[PDB]
Structure 1
Amino acid sequence: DKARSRSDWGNRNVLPASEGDAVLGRTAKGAVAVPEFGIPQLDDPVLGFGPDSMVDPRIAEADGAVWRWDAGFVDESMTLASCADISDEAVADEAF
């Protein structure tokens, strides 16, 4: 059945799989939905969050996407980043 009661949240249904299925008001985890982006301080190329300012390590732990049980946790052991570049000639000639 489709989540109708607030009483069946504990009985039958678990939580929204994708964030387009969230409750009226909130994110997929259940917290309030806030827009991701604020005003950038210090717009500047050399000193400022440019396009290649490297990612915060604390952006995932703060997300909760580092823990495996959370849905945000993507495992990269089977994705294309873990496949060998065949254009590398050290890897082609060895594997020929």
Structure 2
Amino acid sequence: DKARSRSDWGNRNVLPASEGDAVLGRTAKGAVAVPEFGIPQLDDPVLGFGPDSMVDPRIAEADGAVWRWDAGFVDESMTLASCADISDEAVADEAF
């Protein structure tokens, strides 16, 4: 049944699966929720963070999405990116 008491955190329920199912005012991991976005310093097309800036590897390590026991841990084997491009001539020639 539902989670009702403080005693249920140690006996019956484990952890919310999404941010909508989380405790009011906190994340799905139990921490306080921060507004996720700050003030961009140094607006500039060539310098400064932009749409073509690369993704720091320490953003997935900070939120813990690099451990296989994490909710947001991505497995890259069964995705559409792992599929062979059928518009390549060496793929349609080998498969034909």
TM-score bracket for the superposition, by shorter chain length = over 0.9
**What are the superposed Cα offsets for residues 4-47 of structure 1, whole Å, 9 maximum, x if unpaired?**
01111110000000111110110001111001110000110100
| Whole-angstrom CA distance in 1 between matches of 2:90 and 2:6 | 60
User: Match for residue 85 of structure 1?
Assistant: 85
Deviation of the 1:70 alpha carbon: 0.5
SS of residue paired to 1:71: coil
Aligned pairs (5 A) from 1:24-63 = 24-63=24-63
Structure 1: gaps (5+ residues): none
**What are the superposed Cα offsets for residues 43-79 of structure 1, whole Å, 9 maximum, x if unpaired?**
1010011101000100001010010101010111100
Paired-residue identity, %: 100
Structure 2: gaps (5+ residues): none
| Whole-angstrom CA distance in 2 between matches of 1:90 and 1:33 | 49
Across the aligned residues of Structure 1 and Structure 2, the Cα RMSD in angstroms comes to 0.6
More RCO (CA 8 Å, sep 6+) = 2
Count how many residue pairs are aligned between Structure 1 and Structure 2: 96
| Whole-angstrom CA distance in 2 between matches of 1:87 and 1:35 | 43
Deviation of the 1:83 alpha carbon: 0.6
Q: TM-score, normalised by structure 1?
A: 0.97
SS of residue paired to 2:61: helix
SS of residue paired to 2:6: coil
Deviation of the 1:88 alpha carbon: 1.1
Runs of 4+ in structure 1 off by over 6 angstroms are none
User: Match for residue 69 of structure 1?
Assistant: 69
